[PDB]
């Protein structure tokens, strides 16, 4: 309730970690120049891109 646990700081830490992760993802997308670097980014579209690259 008072000392042993400070829940506001925990919530703030969570949100801070999430924001840092999102900024890191954006940095990856900007440095790479591609919007899809992993399949977790977009599954339907990775396959399409690979087939289109083969066709090109």
Half-sphere exposure of 40 (CA within 13 A, CB side): 1
Burial readout 32-53 (b: 16 or more C-beta within 10 A, e: otherwise): eeeeeeeeeeeeeeeeeeeeee
Binding pattern to another protein, positions 34-53, x when CB under 8 A?
----xxx--xx-xxx-xx-x
Is 28 within 8 Å of 37 (Cβ atoms)? yes
Minimum distance of its own copies from residue 25's CB (angstroms): 9
Binding site for its own copies (CB under 8 A): 7-8, 11-12, 15-16, 24, 27-28, 31-33
Binding site for another protein (CB under 8 A): 1-7, 9-11, 13-14, 16, 38-40, 43-44, 46-48, 50-51, 53-54
């Amino acid at each position: 309730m008072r000392i042993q646990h400070n829940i506001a700081a925990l919530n703030t830490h969570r949100n801070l970690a999430a924001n840092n992760a999102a900024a890191s993802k954006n940095l990856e997308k900007l440095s790479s120049g591609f919007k899809i670097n992993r399949a977790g980014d977009d599954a339907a579209g990775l396959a399409i891109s690979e087939k289109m690259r083969g066709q090109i």
